[PDB]
Amino acid sequence: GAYKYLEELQRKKQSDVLRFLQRVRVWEYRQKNVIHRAARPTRPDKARRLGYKAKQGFVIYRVRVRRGKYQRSLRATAEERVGRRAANLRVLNSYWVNQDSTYKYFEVILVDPQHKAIRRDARYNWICDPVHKHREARGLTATGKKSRGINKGHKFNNTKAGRRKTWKRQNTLSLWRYRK
Amino acid sequence: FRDTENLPDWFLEDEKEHSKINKPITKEAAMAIKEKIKAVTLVVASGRNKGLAGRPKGVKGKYKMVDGVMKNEQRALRRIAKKHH
Amino acid sequence: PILKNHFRKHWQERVKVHFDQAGKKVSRRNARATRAAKIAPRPLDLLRPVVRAPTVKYNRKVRAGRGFTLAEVKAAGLTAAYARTIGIAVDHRRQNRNQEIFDANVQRLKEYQSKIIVFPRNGKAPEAEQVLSAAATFPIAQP
Amino acid sequence: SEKAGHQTSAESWGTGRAVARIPRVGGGGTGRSGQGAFGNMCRGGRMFAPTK
Amino acid sequence: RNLSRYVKWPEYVRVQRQKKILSIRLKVPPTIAQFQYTLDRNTAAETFKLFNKYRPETAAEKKERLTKEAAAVAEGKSKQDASPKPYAVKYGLNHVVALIENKKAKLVLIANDVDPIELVVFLPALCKKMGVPYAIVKGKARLGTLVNQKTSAVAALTEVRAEDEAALAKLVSTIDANFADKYDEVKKHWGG
Amino acid sequence: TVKTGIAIGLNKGKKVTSMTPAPKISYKKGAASNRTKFVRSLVREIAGLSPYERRLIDLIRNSGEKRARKVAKKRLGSFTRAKAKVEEMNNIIAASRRH
Amino acid sequence: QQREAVRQLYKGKKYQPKDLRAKKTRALRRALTKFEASQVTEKQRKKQIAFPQRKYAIKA
RNA sequence: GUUUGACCUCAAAUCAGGUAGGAGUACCCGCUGAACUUAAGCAUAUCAAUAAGCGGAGGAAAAGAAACCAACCGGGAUUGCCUUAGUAACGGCGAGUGAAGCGGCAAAAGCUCAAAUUUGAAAUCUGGUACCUUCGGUGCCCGAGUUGUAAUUUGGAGAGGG
RNA sequence: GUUCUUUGUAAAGUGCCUUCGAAGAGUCGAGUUGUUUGGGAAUGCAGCUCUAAGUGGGUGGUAAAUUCCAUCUAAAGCUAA
Numbered sequence A: 001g002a003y004k005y006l007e008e009l010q011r012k013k014q015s016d017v018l019r020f021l022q023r024v025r026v027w028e029y030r031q032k033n034v035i036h037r038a039a040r041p042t043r044p045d046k047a048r049r050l051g052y053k054a055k056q057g058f059v060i061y062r063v064r065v066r067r068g069k070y071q072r073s074l075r076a077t078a079e080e081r082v083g084r085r086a087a088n089l090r091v092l093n094s095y096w097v098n099q100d101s102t103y104k105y106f107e108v109i110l111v112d113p114q115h116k117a118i119r120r121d122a123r124y125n126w127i128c129d130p131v132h133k134h135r136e137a138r139g140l141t142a143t144g145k146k147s148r149g150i151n152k153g154h155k156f157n158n159t160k161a162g163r164r165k166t167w168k169r170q171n172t173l174s175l176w177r178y179r180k
Numbered sequence B: 001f002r003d004t005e006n007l008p009d010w011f012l013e014d015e016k017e018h019s020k021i022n023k024p025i026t027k028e029a030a031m032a033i034k035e036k037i038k039a040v041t042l043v044v045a046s047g048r049n050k051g052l053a054g055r056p057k058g059v060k061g062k063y064k065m066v067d068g069v070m071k072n073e074q075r076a077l078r079r080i081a082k083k084h085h
Numbered sequence C: 001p002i003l004k005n006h007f008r009k010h011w012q013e014r015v016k017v018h019f020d021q022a023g024k025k026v027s028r029r030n031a032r033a034t035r036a037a038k039i040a041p042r043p044l045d046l047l048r049p050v051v052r053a054p055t056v057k058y059n060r061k062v063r064a065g066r067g068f069t070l071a072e073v074k075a076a077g078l079t080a081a082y083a084r085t086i087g088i089a090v091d092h093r094r095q096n097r098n099q100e101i102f103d104a105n106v107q108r109l110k111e112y113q114s115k116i117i118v119f120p121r122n123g124k125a126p127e128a129e130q131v132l133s134a135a136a137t138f139p140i141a142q143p
Numbered sequence D: 001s002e003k004a005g006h007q008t009s010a011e012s013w014g015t016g017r018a019v020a021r022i023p024r025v026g027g028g029g030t031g032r033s034g035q036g037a038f039g040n041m042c043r044g045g046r047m048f049a050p051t052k
Numbered sequence E: 001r002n003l004s005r006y007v008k009w010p011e012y013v014r015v016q017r018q019k020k021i022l023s024i025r026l027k028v029p030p031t032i033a034q035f036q037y038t039l040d041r042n043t044a045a046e047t048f049k050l051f052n053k054y055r056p057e058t059a060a061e062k063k064e065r066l067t068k069e070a071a072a073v074a075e076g077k078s079k080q081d082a083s084p085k086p087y088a089v090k091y092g093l094n095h096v097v098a099l100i101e102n103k104k105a106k107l108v109l110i111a112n113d114v115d116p117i118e119l120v121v122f123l124p125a126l127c128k129k130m131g132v133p134y135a136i137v138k139g140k141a142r143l144g145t146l147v148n149q150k151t152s153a154v155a156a157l158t159e160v161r162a163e164d165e166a167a168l169a170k171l172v173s174t175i176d177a178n179f180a181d182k183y184d185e186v187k188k189h190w191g192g
Numbered sequence F: 001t002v003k004t005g006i007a008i009g010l011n012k013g014k015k016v017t018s019m020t021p022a023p024k025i026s027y028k029k030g031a032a033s034n035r036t037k038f039v040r041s042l043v044r045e046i047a048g049l050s051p052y053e054r055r056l057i058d059l060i061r062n063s064g065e066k067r068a069r070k071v072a073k074k075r076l077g078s079f080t081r082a083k084a085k086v087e088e089m090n091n092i093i094a095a096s097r098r099h
Numbered sequence G: 001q002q003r004e005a006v007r008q009l010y011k012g013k014k015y016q017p018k019d020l021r022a023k024k025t026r027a028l029r030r031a032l033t034k035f036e037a038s039q040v041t042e043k044q045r046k047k048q049i050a051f052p053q054r055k056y057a058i059k060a
Numbered sequence H: 001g002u003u004u005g006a007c008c009u010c011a012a013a014u015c016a017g018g019u020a021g022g023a024g025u026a027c028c029c030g031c032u033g034a035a036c037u038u039a040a041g042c043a044u045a046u047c048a049a050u051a052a053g054c055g056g057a058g059g060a061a062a063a064g065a066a067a068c069c070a071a072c073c074g075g076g077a078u079u080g081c082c083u084u085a086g087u088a089a090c091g092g093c094g095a096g097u098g099a100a101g102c103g104g105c106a107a108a109a110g111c112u113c114a115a116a117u118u119u120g121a122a123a124u125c126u127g128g129u130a131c132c133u134u135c136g137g138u139g140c141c142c143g144a145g146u147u148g149u150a151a152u153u154u155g156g157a158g159a160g161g162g
Numbered sequence I: 001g002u003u004c005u006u007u008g009u010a011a012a013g014u015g016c017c018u019u020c021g022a023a024g025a026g027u028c029g030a031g032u033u034g035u036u037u038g039g040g041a042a043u044g045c046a047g048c049u050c051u052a053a054g055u056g057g058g059u060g061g062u063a064a065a066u067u068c069c070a071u072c073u074a075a076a077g078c079u080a081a
Helices: A005-009 A016-031 A044-049 A075-087 A142-148 A163-170 B007-014 B025-037 B068-084 C021-040 C072-076 C080-086 C099-115 E010-025 E042-052 E059-074 E094-101 E123-129 E141-146 E162-179 F034-047 F051-075 F081-099 G002-009 G033-036 G042-050
Strands: A036-038 A059-066 A090-099 A104-109 A173-176 B040-042 B064-066 C015-018 C050-054 C062-064 C115-117 E107-111 E133-136 E154-159 G055-057
Touching: A005 F034, A016 A059, A016 A104, A016 B007, A016 E010, A016 F034, A036 A044, A036 F034, A059 A075, A075 A090, A075 A104, A090 C021, A163 G033, B064 B068, C050 C099, C072 C080, C072 C099, C099 C115, C099 E107, E042 E141, E042 E162, E094 E154, E107 E123, E123 E133, E123 F034, E133 E162, E141 E154, F051 F081
Parallel strands: A173 C015, B040 B064, E107 E133
Antiparallel strands: A036 A059, A059 A104, A090 A104, C050 C062, C115 G055, E107 E154
16 A cells, blocks of 8 residues: 555655645645645545544644744644634544744644434544534643643653642542541 | 745745744843833811711812821830830 | 641642541442342452562562453463453453462462353343352452 | 621721721612621621631 | 736636746756656557556446346356456555555556645656556546546556457557656756 | 572572563564565655755765764764664665665 | 424425424434444444353352 | 546535534633742742633543553552552752552443455445335435545454465 | 244354564654753653654663663554443
């Protein structure tokens, strides 16, 4: 397949060819709007390994944000922007495309949970449960989880299960009927 | 790298609008921008004037009501400051 | 002397007082009961292995661990996918590096498979009159 | 309750107005105004060692 | 006066026309721009006279075939021999490039105009290095014609019935005579 | 590996029979393979070279591998990464000026 | 009478109108059907076929 | 061939069908975020990674089947409780702050995608429409889709060949 | 407990031998700043800059480095109590 050839290529981000292509694509998108739809994705393999499958309901939007202290990411900022735009849609994940000196350009894999192909095909029926609404704004996609500080171990003690939960857990006095 | 005479100026403007320099913060500038960011009518309050939470008849932009308990208090404070010297 | 409070903060809000104790206990015992009436002939708990614990302060002990290994249960002659249904825990990220422990676990498994009767999927399902703890029936003793 | 007596809008009238220094109420119109609150002694005020 | 050069066009129009202008005016690597040292016409016409014979099965013919072999499987026979070996284009990208390095493709056709061109930038090198009969074509919708899609971006031949073997042989000889001598230089011709 | 029977030493602890388990499959994860070698080499010659790698190959040739090691360890982060990268550059330079 | 006659007219077909569709609640016009939550891939279908939770008991 | 036409990209429609807002907000995930106060005048620091503010959801949420903990005869996803402990560590080593593993215990459930070619048969799917036993199914038809939908496989492994 | 449907060239499991075995990039990591932590000389996160490998990588933090040894497999995802 083309999976690995594409992938190993796109890692080589400072080859002349991809930096050329990046220059063209930035000029293209920069004349375009901030938020817009792409019908088809730029890094299809990357998107596929982040959970796209090309069928009716999976959507792309391509998006521009500013750079230049903001403990969240630009990535997640973009995702809030599109979640507020297309609120029916549900954000699965996102990926870099390109950047500039001034901006960073991103892309996002989305779902329309009303669409019946999605409601069936139970690799993706999990999402039409109401819980995974507006994930990006609760930080439940992968960069949300990074910025929450959610991975494992004694390195990440102060945020492992939610910073605020464990803060309330350990800054509270527990008192029994029978004081120990 | 980025040639100019071949290419069209309508591309060149939006190219060199944003093909900017790479510079992060330096420490002395951090503390420096932090430093830049750094920046009467007394009234014996008896008779008619008493219990008025507003103004009395007698008007001025400053005003100060008194009853005798303040005289006791400030007497005590004059005593204790004398004893503090 | 040195003596330490942590009471400088706004603590009075965040006080959590366990009056809830016997009520919770009763709720729990009801959980056990109805779990039983759901799972009717099964024991409410799995069979669990025997593991020598870490951290030399404790490493003399042995403990009811998580899960029998693929190697152990293979040598007992049966798979993960069957054992998990038969009531047997499996922890895959564990390795067997003590033959004593190995033979202990497999003796425990054999004793289990001997001590059970399995209703098949076919039908008639005889009366079996459950016991409600594997670990009591299959105890875990220091050698 | 945590908030008996605390459900009020007071602060004093102050020093030297021929009246006490209980914290007293703002507003008017109703006849609660000028009454005291946020106290132990006062009507409608909070008790001493609010039982917990 | 007709003022067609003076008008204010729409935006996306402006984008695409400026884009083509820009891709013209830009210096390019040699990897891409072996594209547009692409194929000429009469060979393409012959190529499609060939390929349309080995066009695929459509749904109608598939269900018709299925009804037939449903008729024959039960009483008489099927080892999937009730029907013959079918022979037609292999068209999917992943499958095609999987067939390569086995390697089985007699001929390869590569669209130039694919928008994430990184999909296919590796391919000419690949078929060069494996020594396999590739050629670039003009327009992917053509391939969509011949394998029953809007477009496909690649067409591959691995199997052909016997009558066309030498026809293919001369075909690949032609494109070898177009690439081995004059679009061998696709990386060459730095100006001076 | 074999323990001593005692609290302290080179192999401290309880002296016990081992098993020498199977290896998990999840250690041979960084394994290359015929396919990945093929494609990575392909993409290597196709896209070729970044600018700092150009600086590396000329600098190795003129001013040697000590300078190349330090400057690569600076453009990249770390020591062992700079090691493999300059070793790869030696392989490239051998490739280009032998064949 | 009118409502039920229209029920008979639009009977036995999808896309029946809004007032006659059920009211129930917002997140139970959502909150997917029994079929879509019953739905499961062929893989787990086989898995649950072959190795389901058998029923057992410990006496003997 | 100055005509006709695939397709790409982009637009519209009181198109067919759907859908998001708002409230509530004790609990919960996040963002932004001070002061009084406390301490040597106080600046670091503390009150506080708090209250207020903004966004987001459910009936539970969140986290979760190790890129873990350890250094031993090794344990074994997450969670909560007790215990470590008011320790290790930090800090005008002053105010003062301030954890985790091991252990006991309640509950205990395991797993999926990308990444293999179906290539002797896109094997998949929405939608329109008729019929029917309708939390739906059969068939006919427009159509998405190879810039990859189904099946197989997910590291405990697993695939292909015999 | 009932009745019909039914495992057939269908699906799945299990042994021996053989060739394999793909495993996520502006991402990890490093610098520097800010912010926060109990985190010590970077515990975490963000921004800016740099930018990787595959018998690899992360981690196990000594006033300094090099190699050991151990253990796990990131950058993608689900799940009641």
